[PDB]
Design a protein around this ligand. Structure first.
Ligand SMILES: *[C@@H]1O[C@H](CO)[C@@H](O[C@@H]2O[C@H](CO)[C@@H](O[C@@H]3O[C@H](CO[C@H]4O[C@H](CO)[C@@H](O)[C@H](O)[C@@H]4O)[C@@H](O)[C@H](O[C@H]4O[C@H](CO)[C@@H](O)[C@H](O)[C@@H]4O[C@H]4O[C@H](CO)[C@@H](O)[C@H](O)[C@@H]4O[C@H]4O[C@H](CO)[C@@H](O)[C@H](O)[C@@H]4O)[C@@H]3O)[C@H](O)[C@H]2NC(C)=O)[C@H](O)[C@H]1NC(C)=O
Ligand SMILES: *[C@@H]1O[C@H](CO)[C@@H](O[C@@H]2O[C@H](CO)[C@@H](O[C@@H]3O[C@H](CO[C@H]4O[C@H](CO)[C@@H](O)[C@H](O)[C@@H]4O)[C@@H](O)[C@H](O[C@H]4O[C@H](CO)[C@@H](O)[C@H](O)[C@@H]4O[C@H]4O[C@H](CO)[C@@H](O)[C@H](O)[C@@H]4O[C@H]4O[C@H](CO)[C@@H](O)[C@H](O)[C@@H]4O)[C@@H]3O)[C@H](O)[C@H]2NC(C)=O)[C@H](O)[C@H]1NC(C)=O
Ligand SMILES: *[C@@H]1O[C@H](CO)[C@@H](O[C@@H]2O[C@H](CO)[C@@H](O[C@@H]3O[C@H](CO[C@H]4O[C@H](CO)[C@@H](O)[C@H](O)[C@@H]4O)[C@@H](O)[C@H](O[C@H]4O[C@H](CO)[C@@H](O)[C@H](O)[C@@H]4O[C@H]4O[C@H](CO)[C@@H](O)[C@H](O)[C@@H]4O[C@H]4O[C@H](CO)[C@@H](O)[C@H](O)[C@@H]4O)[C@@H]3O)[C@H](O)[C@H]2NC(C)=O)[C@H](O)[C@H]1NC(C)=O
Ligand SMILES: *[C@@H]1O[C@H](CO)[C@@H](O[C@@H]2O[C@H](CO)[C@@H](O[C@@H]3O[C@H](CO[C@H]4O[C@H](CO)[C@@H](O)[C@H](O)[C@@H]4O)[C@@H](O)[C@H](O[C@H]4O[C@H](CO)[C@@H](O)[C@H](O)[C@@H]4O[C@H]4O[C@H](CO)[C@@H](O)[C@H](O)[C@@H]4O[C@H]4O[C@H](CO)[C@@H](O)[C@H](O)[C@@H]4O)[C@@H]3O)[C@H](O)[C@H]2NC(C)=O)[C@H](O)[C@H]1NC(C)=O
Ligand SMILES: *[C@@H]1O[C@H](CO)[C@@H](O[C@@H]2O[C@H](CO)[C@@H](O)[C@H](O)[C@H]2NC(C)=O)[C@H](O)[C@H]1NC(C)=O
Ligand SMILES: *[C@@H]1O[C@H](CO)[C@@H](O[C@@H]2O[C@H](CO)[C@@H](O)[C@H](O)[C@H]2NC(C)=O)[C@H](O)[C@H]1NC(C)=O
Ligand SMILES: *[C@@H]1O[C@H](CO)[C@@H](O[C@@H]2O[C@H](CO)[C@@H](O)[C@H](O)[C@H]2NC(C)=O)[C@H](O)[C@H]1NC(C)=O
Ligand SMILES: *[C@@H]1O[C@H](CO)[C@@H](O[C@@H]2O[C@H](CO)[C@@H](O)[C@H](O)[C@H]2NC(C)=O)[C@H](O)[C@H]1NC(C)=O
Ligand SMILES: *[C@@H]1O[C@H](CO)[C@@H](O)[C@H](O)[C@H]1NC(C)=O
Ligand SMILES: *[C@@H]1O[C@H](CO)[C@@H](O)[C@H](O)[C@H]1NC(C)=O
Ligand SMILES: *[C@@H]1O[C@H](CO)[C@@H](O)[C@H](O)[C@H]1NC(C)=O
Ligand SMILES: [Ca+2]
Ligand SMILES: [Ca+2]
Ligand SMILES: [Ca+2]
Ligand SMILES: [Ca+2]
Ligand SMILES: [Ca+2]
Lengths: 388, 388, 388, 388
């Protein structure tokens, strides 16, 4: 109909309720489920769906061997009905590639897939299910993007890309698209020293992205975008409650404009909702591996370098595997506020579980509740032994 | 379009005709059928569908081992086309959880799923396929609901929940929802001493629920709801034709306001159509187990403590496994009256058939006929030996 | 929109072109294809689909053992997209039962399924996918119907049913339905001595049904129905070109009002297009078994007791298995005439191929061409050995 | 809505971006994927889909044995969602046969399938999913057509057919269809000596077809059609950059009106975009087998007998199997020009890989970009050893 405008603020997050869970690995042990990774969730005005990068093979299939690898010609961005697993028969291919993002502007959806060899990748921007624009690699070193939904305001959908080194300064760009066309792009500015895999959400005409500094920071970089002025700023979450993985133990004081040191060249896609006292941070429980997952209410985390948790909710036990996590919201829901949501990728297989030769995942997702709900843990649920 | 109003009375039930049957267990022996239990049927203005709580695994899958358990993080309310089996590829997830209800108000559908550990469960009410309201456990002991469809009148959809003990007094509440929002809730009143798993239907602006007294009664408690005044009453079916399972043998006189004694802390979800002389009761044939199923016309069963059968129809032979049973009607059918319908869950596997490690079921459903139709029996039809 | 009216006459049939073929048995050797029999084809204003009676199991499934049996509680009328096979995942259940018919009146579809034990069967008439009317057995001996599509004119859809003996006089009735309701029914009249499994088509406000005399005739009985007056007549195809199976060899003169003798208590569902010189008869090539299939142009076959073929087309070689055959037309196609169509059931398995324990079939269907097209043969195509 | 008119010219092709890839063989190793060959892509105003000739069996199925054969009664033209594989459950049958073409005229789609024995084949033209016209073989020797999409202009959709010898002069006809009806047909004229499997596209009210001279030419014949005047011309691509397979090595000067000699009675379906300096030719890398695939910018290839490449892009490495290739465009995309697209059939199995008994393929497809994008190679990706 008309382009969606981020006119609402976030609902008060007093807890998280279960939203969707596909049990993909459990089910796929005996059905035609595609191997995936890098999943996310994204809504259209009339439906919300699961998304992920397929590996072009079923989990039980012999070609599942080797799926620990991130980039190949057999990957594609696929979407499928909420809480169903990604099967060969119900998965819709959005585009071909090994890195992606996607978002609905209120009229139709834009999907972006990057493919290519490491030194010669290219992004193709699809709009209304047709290819419209292409962008060639600018630094010839793994052109890559969000791996979770983008956000639009009045037809303008900003997207963060990075090209170049993963362990030194790289060239990050913010593209402002409208109907799949490039209105403008800027180089990253601000104090964030390295950006990768941004998780974004929008509220009150502003888009907030919590990304990952693979190079040096264990605290997360944040990019705040003005989609009208088509400008942005960047900094790090000030809070001592560190949210990357791996990471050092939490200090008593964090860093607002520099990476918090202790762990180099590694990390995991993650997210946060930065809204004053209504601030919630997601993170793996383990400081060493992609294990467990918890949400922590850390009032003013973005700007307070001594902020610590006032409430929390465990999502996945530390004795269970987690993975990437990102933000999304149903911008077309009823009500006066946007309900914050997120997903956690529950990785199974390699490298942690090497008795099998594949790597895949399932998805669990929650949204906020203004109630103070009881908590449960949500593991993948599959028994690896069954796959042997 | 407009909210549906319960303006019609029930059609005269002179017999029951076959409505739907999915043969899920037979088919699933060699196809991707999800393991389920707690099924039901519910109609939208343009389609009627089968519903059930998936176990997050196929029957042939290795994760089917252990599905005798009722609550886990791998369950979800799913719906699928009438008479098809619940397959991985055609099952639509309504919400995540281990206890549910769902009903269409004429404009859109409300689905409710409860999830959580036993001492910290919560219900999330979905409307128009979006989460709208959440209710935290009030007694910290297995918050649970109907396991069959709710009913709406002018947008108001009452739902019966129970939280607390299964073998002593508990806290049952009647919630009046409208567009997924809580208009009001009441504690249970009347003479019913314990309520669980209500089976409801509506006619002439009144909603009748036949539930189960797990604690003491072998006769069934009944809750009659006024969805306009948003008030209710409760009693037991007066009839000596006892309809819970297990149960003692039928006496010559029943109880109207107390549980009929003889069997404690056990029972099965069931239903009835209480409409004066047009009254029909469903029940297992066996007084000891979930075996067989029959419909008995017991005129004035609700109010006559000496009422006995005047007609009957066998649905499932006593040599075949049955299970839960509940009511539903197509409130959007043509004609001058609502045609009473019901389903019977045909449980296969554990605990009765323990040579297999799973527990699942298929569904059979009938609706009333004003004709006096010949009868057939409708078993699940699967051979357990094939699964060995 | 509006009820369809049989305003056109048949197109001139100069040959038959391939219309649809599902290769169900070939495909089902390694995919989730339901076991079926008694198939047919029927069109809606916007789509034409394959129909059949499922056996409630896949062909590869262990429950396929015993599917030679015609009636069980596990059968149902299913429909699926033209030329696709009947799979667990794409088959839509129309109703439950072991004998059926179905037809679209231009506004919506009426489907009829009969279920029950032999002495207590009942038909339930569905309209707009809802049960509307039920008819109890009148002779307590296998109430049964067409097994191919019915035909409507101005909302009136006549259907032929038979109840009683298969080897002596029975009680055949013609029901005139409108919106699933019974407007009227008549007992069979005319000279046809026994009627079963009528194959019908409509043209110029008249409905012609070629049925089967299981009792005595090797020539086929024909019922011509006036859907406006709601009256009918019956006789036999006069032609010496005999079209039942089994049957004696063709004589030089046939019978117009008596069964042509030579074979008792057996037969096969079949069809014909009786339109003066534009008359075409279908039949198995073998006089002993359901083997092969051919179309023969026999001018004035219905009324000329010495009529013999003037043209022909082989459909299935005598070295290949055939089975039931029936008529249907797309009453919603463009043009000035109705194009005659038919299907042939290609039965595989028992009793002819007893190395397997199942019985199923695939479907081949053709429509007429005004051209004189070259001919091909169309076998099922599966290798039974693969199933061993 | 209204018939589409070829009002735009081609976009400038500066490189090719990835459009779709189904990874059919990889996926089908462990899922219900139909065996196919002769694939293509074709768009409707609201969706673009993959098309191919099914073999009526899954790849893992036992009936896959022998699928190297081109014509049988078990083949059919099927279409399925872009980039999904052709599965038993998502494949839509357009018509039955072993040679086909299909195209949308802006209002609805026309599909053509030819079936029959070699000496008695016939084409049936479907429009709006109904059979409308039939054409009998005129030379009694494998009536055959494009194997890729046709193109329409103001409702007129020309199609090229060939009947007769594959190794001597044959009878090629150009049919001009409108709503499935024949408006006119012409015999082939011009200097092309033999025509088979034309790949066509339209721009500025002209339709260009790059075909294959199976008899003598290693350079490709080209047919340019005027869909308004319903007339055409034919010649060969003048360029010395030879594009059939097998073929001799490239000379320094080609032939404009005669086949370039060196290889007789063999070839492969291929295509080209002939647009002055914006000319791009596709071809296998190997001159001996269907191995590899590359796009070469050869300015004025059609008319310049000394034209050589000025740019290029490798699509499939010479160490990977290719096959047929053809053209298609989304005539309903936004913008001022038509974006040239093509697909490459990646054949697996026999005859090159004879350790398996089947022959199938997957599909890769690209569209042009005005950018100068980096290149990747796109192989089928399956490991034959897994199928052993
Ligand atoms: C039924 O359901 C309800 C609802 O869920 C249940 O109630 C919830 O219970 C939760 C668990 O108790 C609770 O979550 C905790 O909240 C704490 C904050 O509240 C307390 O402090 C505030 C502020 O003073 C008070 O107002 C309030 O009254 C409380 O006293 C958080 O602090 C908790 O998080 C910390 O602990 C957990 C372990 O429990 C860690 O995993 C987590 O990371 C936090 O601790 C680490 O980080 C901090 C900050 O840097 C460090 O100081 C600390 O030492 C830890 O650091 C180590 O560990 C991390 C992670 O591994 C590592 O990176 C670091 O380097 C160190 O090694 C926790 O979030 C909910 O708020 C509460 N909800 C409600 C509404 O009440 C109820 O129990 C359930 N009922 C039943 C019967 O089960
Ligand atoms: C073709 O189809 C038609 C249509 O279906 C077939 O006709 C039907 O036939 C049915 C079977 O005969 C019949 O069903 C029975 O109806 C009885 C009522 O009718 C009779 O009584 C009335 C009232 O006097 C008369 O008007 C009428 O003329 C009849 O005489 C019911 O009473 C029957 O139910 C009882 O019996 C069955 C076993 O048959 C039990 O399973 C059932 O639970 C009932 O009996 C138990 O309960 C009562 C009440 O407390 C006890 O008194 C009794 O002792 C039993 O108690 C024990 O068992 C229960 C259950 O296990 C346990 O809990 C308890 O503790 C005790 O141990 C039965 O419903 C249909 O009405 C009839 N329909 C029609 C339209 O005619 C026809 O036969 C078919 N034709 C062919 C050729 O097959
Ligand atoms: C390319 O394609 C074209 C188009 O398909 C091919 O041309 C077609 O070729 C067909 C086969 O030749 C042909 O079909 C036959 O047509 C005959 C009628 O035409 C002839 O007679 C008329 C009338 O005089 C002439 O006008 C005309 O010129 C012809 O001369 C039919 O009579 C044929 O049917 C009979 O024969 C077949 C076997 O071929 C039997 O299976 C069939 O049942 C018919 O014969 C039985 O029945 C009759 C009637 O009672 C008996 O008299 C006879 O003895 C047989 O009876 C025995 O067998 C039956 C069945 O088993 C049993 O029940 C009984 O008891 C006895 O045991 C046949 O239909 C097409 O018309 C023709 N089409 C066209 C447009 O030309 C062309 O060949 C192909 N090209 C190539 C290169 O292959
Ligand atoms: C990142 O991505 C970019 C974008 O893709 C990469 O850049 C591309 O690199 C490509 C590979 O170098 C390049 O493709 C080549 O383009 C040549 C034309 O450009 C050159 O000549 C023009 C004209 O003078 C100059 O303007 C220009 O500056 C260049 O110098 C083509 O000529 C190439 O095709 C020929 O070579 C390939 C092998 O590379 C053959 O397979 C192909 O068939 C062509 O050669 C055969 O055919 C010709 C014509 O008859 C014969 O003369 C020749 O001898 C060959 O003949 C034999 O082989 C054939 C085929 O087997 C057989 O039939 C015959 O009988 C003989 O046996 C090639 O197309 C892109 O244009 C370029 N793109 C851009 C935008 O720059 C970049 O490298 C990537 N980066 C990294 C780091 O990898
Ligand atoms: C989002 O904001 C823009 C205004 O910036 C709205 O766009 C206007 O919509 C009406 C109706 O389509 C037009 O007549 C105006 O010209 C539109 N645009 C501009 C850019 O002025 C848009 O409708 C808003 N979206 C919603 C859902 O209300
Ligand atoms: C069910 O009853 C309510 C009346 O209580 C009907 O609601 C009215 O509908 C018309 C048309 O939508 C409105 O103009 C009235 O204001 C509505 N509501 C009320 C609450 O007054 C409703 O239409 C009835 N449903 C049906 C199917 O007739
Ligand atoms: C089939 O015939 C009936 C007439 O018998 C047509 O029905 C009339 O249709 C118009 C428009 O719906 C009405 O105003 C008339 O009253 C209708 N019926 C009768 C029974 O008189 C019907 O439209 C015809 N069908 C088609 C497709 O034209
Ligand atoms: C393609 O060209 C034809 C004109 O040749 C357009 O057809 C005209 O469309 C309008 C509206 O449908 C009619 O009133 C004219 O009579 C149509 N036809 C002719 C043949 O004159 C057609 O609309 C054009 N297609 C598009 C998409 O614009
Ligand atoms: C099922 O689980 C039980 C309990 O863990 C185990 O002992 C049993 O062997 C399992 N059965 C199968 C077939 O795996
Ligand atoms: C099929 O059933 C028959 C009869 O019960 C039995 O003897 C036979 O062995 C079964 N065949 C198979 C393969 O199970
Ligand atoms: C395939 O068919 C050939 C030829 O009939 C046969 O010899 C061969 O063994 C078959 N291969 C397999 C795996 O069945
Ligand atoms: Ca880091
Ligand atoms: Ca399988
Ligand atoms: Ca009880
Ligand atoms: Ca007979
Ligand atoms: Ca050639």
């Amino acid at each position: 109909r008309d382009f969606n405008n981020l006119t609402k603020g976030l609902c008060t997050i007093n807890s998280w309720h279960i939203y969707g869970k596909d049990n993909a690995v459990r089910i796929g042990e005996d059905s035609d489920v595609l191997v995936t990774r890098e999943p996310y969730v994204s809504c259209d005005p009339d439906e919300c769906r699961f998304y992920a990068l397929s590996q072009g093979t079923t989990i039980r299939g012999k070609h599942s061997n080797g799926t620990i690898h991130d980039r190949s010609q057999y990957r594609a961005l696929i979407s499928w009905p909420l809480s169903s697993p990604p099967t060969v028969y119900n998965s819709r291919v959005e585009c071909i590639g090994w890195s992606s993002t996607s978002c609905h502007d209120g009229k139709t959806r834009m999907s972006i897939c990057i493919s290519g060899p490491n030194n010669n990748a290219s992004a193709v921007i699809w709009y209304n299910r047709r290819p419209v624009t292409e962008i060639n690699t600018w630094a010839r070193n793994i052109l890559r993007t969000q791996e979770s939904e983008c956000v639009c305001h009045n037809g303008v959908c900003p997207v963060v890309f990075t090209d170049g080194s993963a362990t030194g300064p790289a060239e990050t760009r913010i593209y402002y698209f409208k109907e799949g066309k490039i209105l403008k792009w800027e180089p990253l500015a601000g104090t964030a020293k390295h950006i990768e895999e941004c998780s974004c959400y929008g509220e009150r005409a502003e888009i907030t992205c919590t990304c990952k500094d693979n190079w040096q920071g264990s605290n997360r970089p944040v990019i705040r975008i003005d989609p009208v002025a088509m400008t942005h700023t960047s900094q790090y979450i000030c809070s001592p409650v560190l949210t990357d993985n791996p990471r050092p133990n939490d200090p008593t004081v964090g860093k607002c404009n520099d990476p918090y040191p202790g762990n180099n060249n590694n990390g995991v896609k993650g997210f946060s909702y930065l809204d004053g006292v209504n601030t919630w941070l997601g993170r793996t429980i383990s400081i060493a591996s992609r294990s467990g997952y918890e949400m922590l209410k850390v009032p003013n985390a973005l700007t307070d370098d001594k902020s610590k948790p006032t409430q929390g909710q465990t999502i996945v036990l530390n004795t269970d595997w987690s993975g990437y996590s990102g933000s999304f919201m149903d911008y077309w829901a009823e009500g006066e506020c946007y309900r914050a949501c997120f997903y956690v990728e529950l990785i199974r297989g390699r490298p942690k579980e090497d008795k099998v030769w594949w790597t895949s995942n399932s998805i669990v997702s929650m949204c906020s509740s203004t109630e103070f709900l009881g908590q449960w843990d949500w593991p993948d649920g599959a028994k690896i032994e069954y796959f042997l």
